[PDB]
Amino acid sequence: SRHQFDLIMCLKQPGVQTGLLCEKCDGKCPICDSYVRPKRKVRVCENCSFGKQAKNCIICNLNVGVNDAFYCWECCRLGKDKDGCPRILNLG
Amino acid sequence: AEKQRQLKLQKIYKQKYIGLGDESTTREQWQRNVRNDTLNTLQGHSASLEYVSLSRGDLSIRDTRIHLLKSMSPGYKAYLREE
Amino acid sequence: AKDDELYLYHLTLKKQTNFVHSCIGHFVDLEAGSKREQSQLCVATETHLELYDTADGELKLIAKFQNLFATITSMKSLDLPWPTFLALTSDSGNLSIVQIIMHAGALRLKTLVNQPLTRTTLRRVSPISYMEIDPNGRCIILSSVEQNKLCFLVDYAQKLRISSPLEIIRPHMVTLDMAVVDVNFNNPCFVTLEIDNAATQLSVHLIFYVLELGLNHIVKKADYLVNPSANFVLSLPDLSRYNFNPFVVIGFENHILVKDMNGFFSLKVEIPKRSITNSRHKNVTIISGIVQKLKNDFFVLLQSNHGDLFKLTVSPDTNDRNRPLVQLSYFDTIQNSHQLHIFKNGYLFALSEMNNNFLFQFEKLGVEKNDFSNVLTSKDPNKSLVFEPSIKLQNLSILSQQ
Amino acid sequence: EKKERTLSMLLLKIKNGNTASRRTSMRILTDKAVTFGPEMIFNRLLPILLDRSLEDQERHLMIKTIDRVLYQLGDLTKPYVHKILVVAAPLLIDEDPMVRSTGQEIITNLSTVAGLKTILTVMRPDIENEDEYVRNVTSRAAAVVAKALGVNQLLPFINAACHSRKSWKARHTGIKIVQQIGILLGIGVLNHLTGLMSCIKDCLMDDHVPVRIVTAHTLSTLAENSYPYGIEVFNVVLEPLWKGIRSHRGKVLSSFLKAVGSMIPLMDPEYAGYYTTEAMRIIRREFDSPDDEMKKTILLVLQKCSAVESITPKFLREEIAPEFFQKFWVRRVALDRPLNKVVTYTTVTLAKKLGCSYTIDKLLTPLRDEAEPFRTMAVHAVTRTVNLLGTADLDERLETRLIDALLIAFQEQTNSDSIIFKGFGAVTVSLDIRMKPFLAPIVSTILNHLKHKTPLVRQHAADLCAILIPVIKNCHEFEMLNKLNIILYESLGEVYPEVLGSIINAMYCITSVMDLDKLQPPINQILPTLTPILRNKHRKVEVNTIKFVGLIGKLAPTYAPPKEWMRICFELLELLKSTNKEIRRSANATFGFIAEAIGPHDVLVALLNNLKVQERQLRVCTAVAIGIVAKVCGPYNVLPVIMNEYTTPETNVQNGVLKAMSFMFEYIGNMSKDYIYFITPLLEDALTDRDLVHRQTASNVITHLALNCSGTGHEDAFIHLMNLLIPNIFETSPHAIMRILEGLEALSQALGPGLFMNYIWAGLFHPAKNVRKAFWRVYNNMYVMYQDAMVPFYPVTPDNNEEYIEELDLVL
Amino acid sequence: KRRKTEKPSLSQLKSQVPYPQIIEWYDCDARYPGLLASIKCTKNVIPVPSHWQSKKEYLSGRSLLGKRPFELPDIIKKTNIEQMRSTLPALDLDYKKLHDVFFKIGANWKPDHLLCFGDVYYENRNLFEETNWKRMVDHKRP
Amino acid sequence: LDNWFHVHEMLQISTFRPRTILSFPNNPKSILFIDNHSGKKQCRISLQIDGECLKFGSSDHLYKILDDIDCVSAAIIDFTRQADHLIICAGDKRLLTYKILVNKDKLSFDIELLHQTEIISPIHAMLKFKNFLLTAMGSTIVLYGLGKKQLLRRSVTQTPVSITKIVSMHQWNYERLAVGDIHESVTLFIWDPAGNVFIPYVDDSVKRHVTVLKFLDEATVIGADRYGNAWTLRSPPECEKIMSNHDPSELSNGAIKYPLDVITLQQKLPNTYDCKFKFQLLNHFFVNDIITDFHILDSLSNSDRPGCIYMGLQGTVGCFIPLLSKGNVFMMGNIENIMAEADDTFYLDYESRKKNNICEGSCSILGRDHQEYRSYYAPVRKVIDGDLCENFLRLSLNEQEFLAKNLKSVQVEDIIQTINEVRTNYM
RNA sequence: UUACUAAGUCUCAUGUACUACAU
RNA sequence: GUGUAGUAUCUGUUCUUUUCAGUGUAACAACUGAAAUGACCUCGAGGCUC
């Protein structure tokens, strides 16, 4: 993540699925963790969804998220939107 | 830890986007990336492809496109030499 | 102080005319309450996009769609077991499947699903510039000029559904000329020509891929090394009458090959040549092949750099055995055309990368396979036929020019 | 080969260990399963997952390992088919959907490992299990094996082994496997529809009633899987399905009706009416079901028929409305939960076709009845019908009857029935302008429900008042405002937090509908009364109080002393970063109006003075307040005072300034373009400052500022800002290096690569082994974001490199 | 060893260069010196800021001690908040005033110094004296 | 809106592929065409004036054939006001002079070979200087006069080391020049009489591959790219003051007093600042085509605002209209800002309604943002793109009124007014 | 008329801030 | 107004085996290994010295 360093990402070709984030993490752009003017919903590779792990918050990787994560307009222009599958594999 | 992550992201970005100069990169390795991307865009835009077709004067345009594709590999020079 | 700051207002008065992509689908149903006909075409130049119909034997502007503000790097229609809507890939990497709809009093282009791929730019890693769709519309495949290839499995429902991408990554293999082979629903199979990026020698090797719907991944099948002179691949539909084993047509420069998937049959047929061979004479090539099949008769049209339009049919060679043969002949030719389509009607749309797109209806259909004079066979692969071009224009008849 | 047993310990390393250390075991076993022995490998892999200790992630790992082993040991999996079939069979019949999915995947992998003949020879002799559970498990196993090994690949063998007349066991197992395959495949039964109907039609006229019921169930499953279109194969048994509706007895007629309920919606428009008329002889006659299996089936069939477009609304009102109202529309199911749901759903589905007024004037009795059990279901169905149809089909007498029934249900709410609470708002919304003539009825109802002084009763009353507040108070009355405000501010100290939140919401709705001083509670009294309420730690209470304080300063921005508003803002500034995002949104929604009413200069000075206090654990939120107060007129009122706060010599203050500048820029996309030039002299001393902190946060300013201002034409200023950045590239530390990288990447968008390139190029290689490592980071990010963009800008000439490109010099 | 001693002389490298005066002694150890000379001496490239090879972390500057804390742009100084709030060791303002200062008054306004295409800020540099310099070449005439 | 033009023109294919197009300066419109042969090197010249073409002499043919002459580049020149000559540059590296004749009521074109001159370079670019041919070698710029039996070198100007080749170049009122490169960018020269040389007074900022180049003014330049960038540059006022207040003869040698910063940029950065000034980027734009021809028209169909219209290679014609006043570009800028993220606004509305109860690229149909696509190679600077705001016209009234609510400014109707104002009034 | 550059490492002391942790 | 552990930063102080070779470095630095002993001449320097 932008702040916590040891957090590792996925970075695969995103699928059709949309990543979920919990109400606790709601509002953060999964890359920069910004609250401003979100744009496009996150898309994750199928390898990050499958079973129960699909329900996890793509940000904090623990809680079960209801909400969809959106990229901000700064990351959508920086292109990090399309970089790959954001997810946090290690808890940190 | 942080730099150590930058190493892994160096491996991933290098894998996806092919040539990315890390620290020490030979001029042969890097110039090859230059040639590959320049040709890539010359053939990639139908615009510049149409342009090189006429300025070169080839009989067909796909000759220029597949020419650039072939020109991406180094051995294509010797290949032309053997014609 | 007055700020200079020149403020320019850009307008496109006339929109880009070099048509780089086309698709054969039937998009909108207009002026008719209930009608379904496969005869229609949508053609795209980068930004600019247009939709033409014929149905009269004469091409017609339908509507000039709004400016997309991107570089469309490939466009192919998809037909699924329904209104046929076109899959469109461009810069941003997004695979954008769009349906042309009638909204308010005009035809507007609606998008269904856009899938993010690579980044926003024209790139070599970008899985664009090479695209094709399963002729039965089960799956769409994008690839990159070099790095990687992605194939989505397309499914239709109350809402359209694009399956997760199927990745194959070959680091040093530069891909060129994606050509997908039709199937009977067995399994989708696509064919490419991979030129190695890092090598001591120039090596252009064809490779076959069978996507396995059962195992849900693309499988490398046959890697056949061919001369560096290779140009393109075309798909021979079945050869079900002669002897899952797809057969491809590899256009080289001065001759044509066809190759089996199992490598059992490799047929070399030397491409004929003009009589004049004016001044600078290249080994030429064939720029565009296409396939057509009707009444057990399937012929393909492959045009050289000079614009010479040729056909192939397959013969069993009943004397020896039942085995494929390859027979070239000569047609009306044309000017160099980037891509060729054929309606279910006898109309053949010739999209010229040079200047003008023009449509035909073929009647003579060309010379019969019986003549040994002007027709070449796979009997003797080493042979040459010289021919004088025909401006009399017997075979093909221009209907409409653009 | 005893080391393979240690591979099981390696499997523990795949379970107990690290992700890469766990995947390495699978990657190694993938290339070693062929040299491990199929017998011992299976004997060690199957019991490992067969034990109850197989967790969810453990089950997934074991399934992946078994799939890899099968992909490696394809022919070797044949002798072990008797093992997995005895293990994967129960797991496929588990309760959780994940367990059944994993079992089906394991069965499909085992089937694809060997051939179809092995699966046939394994599942065929397993039909001797007289237990119904074992027989169903074997049928599901065969269906899963056929769903992956090819439906027509096992269709002929199954049709040849089941078409005999051995006993009822095989005849039942055939239809069971057919239904299981149709349920597991799903929409993939289109091509194999007729191919399966040809073998399933042997039970439509079967002698044994059990075989007939199994065939009917299989036909219904196939029709549901292949629905809605494609009823061609359904015509192969459509005649018996339409004939035997009033021909079978008990279970036979039940199965026939269950199949017809699925076949009707998939049928055409012509034969649908005939099929409905032929099935009504046994459906409408037996509408009263002695048991639940018949009643639920009849309800589902009626719902499916109502969904079909064949039987129009006239036929339903003629032959379907009276029977459905007599045998079904009654309070006889006041306790059946499944029946209360099924009948309610069927009524809600049929009301849209038979007209809402046809049922709104016929269901005004079940809700007003003294039986609260059936009254709850009646109110639920009424609310569903009102939400589906709306308020068009509402007669005067029908509307009066509905209002009377709703009032009687709300007054006679002896239990905690939320159905009436949810339907009251829907009825009030359906009233619309008609609620004005019906004002005093609902007014007295709300008064009696509010003055009851009951906790749950007061909560429900406040909820219903807040739901129907804008419909009643906004009717241009100016008479009930005082009567509502006198009772609203009365119970202000409710100990129950939910009741307090409901009262706050009702007061907010009243203040939104009422004005100053049209509202009954005085503004000068409600403000100091609501002030301590915002200090509460309750989530919903504080969330409602924030919106109440915001709407208090809506139409009337005054109604307060400036000191009171300043104190309220200082108190709410600490809640701008709460855990619940709703409070964080409400705080920003209220602070905007608060600052617009108070004043720009006063709020700006207060926020600036607050920067030094409230040390950096919640200080940044105050900066957000600066950026939140500069959104009504833009950031042209906050920025000048910010720049002075930067003129202050204190480091921490300057840092808070620069970061506040970052955030105030990221919150404004199109605003900063005009403000950019006034920033650059401030970043002049920032980027030049010796402190890596100031250089860091200044770079963070350049990130957002450059991203949102890119392409505006300020590049000449961006050129400056960069010219100060380039020397900082060599600066170490993770925070500094990533902030500076992101800053330079933002500059790539505002300048374009070309100049940004020019720097990167003149530093691109270099001997220093350090300078090189540093700049190749920036060039890596540049190559990531841009490639074609950099193509023209490569400083490459024929003397620069050997091959160059021959096609760049072409000129036409 | 041999590669370190294989290096051509910098003056041997000068001849390959159209603008030989940019190349410096350390370019001898450039792993690809013939290439690095072409890039570094290419037309529009801007040589690396020279604060590298110094261990001072780019700012030890004695001049940094004597730098002014800040000065408001005179257009913003017109807004009078300088007197309203004392930054050196409440002030009611008008929305029209502030808005007009940035837009009506300050639309055409631009910082006086800025910098140029290849301007790079070395540690010892201070722009302010050069600002008074450029302004002075303007006002003062013989 | 879709067409804005009409095109006045068995299988028909001509062996001759056209090359360039020329027009006489003295005759207001007389258009001479030059083609090539695909085959043995051969050419044709077809002149048209007024309605249809011309005959050649008394012959039936309407065109002239030139055997063994191929044209790499060609331009027509009038050395004297009463005489008209044509200029060919052969791939043999030979400069061929011709003479044009109009028969006038016998009317026909008669071309006459005059001289033969050997050339060192291919001559990719040439144009009309006063009384002279102004041509560009690969490295250097030669100004040929009129000699007899062959044409003479009147003056030669050696280029700065940066320029490898000259693709195209253009002049401003014979005093000034803008010289383009393949690799590098435009560099402006000034003709100095009695110095008999062009002196470069300004460099360009970045590397840009310039296909075609023109002048709007004395101090500004239009240029396109091989890669599709349409840009316009301006000399800095620091340079304009110097050249307005000084004679060109003092630039090369003599006393010209440069501010302290310029010299410090000369010794500090001799490679970039060799030309001692720099073009501040003025306008930048990206049109995905490759612009062949710019033309600056003082008026487009009598319109006041002078436009510049360009034809691209892949084919296109488009215009850049300078906007008078400000609130023109303020309203236009706000409309472009609306239509830019309009697809995102639809996505956020469609998102909120899903929170209370259409993909992201709905309105754009493609993922590319406007600022991103049009920025591309280099960010658009002052140019606002009208081709976007034009899409606002097609959207339904519900969508348009949904978009314009973001403005406190005028209603959708006045929006459409301002949008449609450009084609009407500005051309 | 003086044409503009000095501290570094170690050692043993002094100057001043700070970070976890406990009453 | 305290204690436990620990950190950073000034300043003071001072120059570590004379050399060789390797690593290392942009060059330094730093690190790694060994060790001359004796005689003579001119003004710490110097030796085709033995």
Residue numbers in the entry:
A (entry chain S): 2 to 93
B (entry chain Z): 2 to 84
C (entry chain P): 53 to 133, 144 to 305, 323 to 481
D (entry chain O): 160 to 971
E (entry chain Q): 125 to 213, 239 to 291
F (entry chain P): 882 to 890, 918 to 1265, 1292 to 1361
Can I see the authors' text?
Here, by deleting the branch-site adenosine (BS-A) or mutating the branch-site sequence of an actin pre-mRNA, we stall the assembly of spliceosomes in extracts from the yeast Saccharomyces cerevisiae directly before the A complex is formed. We then determine the three-dimensional structure of this newly identified assembly intermediate by cryo-electron microscopy. Our structure indicates that the U2–BS helix has formed in this pre-A complex, but is not yet clamped by the HEAT domain of the Hsh155 protein (Hsh155HEAT), which exhibits an open conformation. Thus, Prp5 proofreads the branch site indirectly, hindering spliceosome assembly if branch-site mutations prevent the remodelling of Hsh155HEAT.
To isolate a spliceosome assembly intermediate formed directly before the A complex that still contains Prp5, we carried out splicing in S. cerevisiae cell extracts with an actin (Act) pre-mRNA in which the BS-A is deleted. Spliceosomal complexes formed on ΔBS-A Act pre-mRNA lack the U4/U6.U5 tri-snRNP, but contain stoichiometric amounts of U1 and U2 snRNPs. The proteins Prp5, Msl5 and Mud2 are also abundant, whereas Cus2 is absent, indicating that these complexes stall after Prp5 hydrolyses ATP, but before the tri-snRNP has docked. We next carried out single-particle cryo-electron microscopy (cryo-EM) and determined the structure of the ΔBS-A complex at an average resolution of 5.9 Å (ranging from roughly 4.5 Å for U1 to approximately 15 Å for U2). By fitting known X-ray structures of spliceosome components into the EM density map, together with protein crosslinking coupled with mass spectrometry (CXMS), we generated a three-dimensional (3D) model of the ΔBS-A complex. This complex consists of two major elongated domains—comprising the U1 and bipartite U2 snRNPs—that are connected by two main bridges. In the pre-A complex, U1 and U2 are connected by a second bridge comprising intron nucleotides upstream of the branch site. Thus, formation of the U2–BS helix alone does not appear to trigger closure of Hsh155HEAT. As the U2–BS helix has formed, but Hsh155HEAT still exhibits an open conformation and Prp5 is stably bound (see below), we conclude that ΔBS-A complexes are stalled at a pre-A-complex stage, after Prp5-mediated formation of the U2–BS helix, but during/before it carries out its proofreading function. Comparison of our pre-A complex with the previously published yeast A complex reveals that the transition from the pre-A to the A complex involves large-scale remodelling that requires displacement of Prp5. The repositioning of U1 and the U2 3′-region is essential to generate the binding platform needed to dock the U4/U6.U5 tri-snRNP during formation of the pre-B complex.
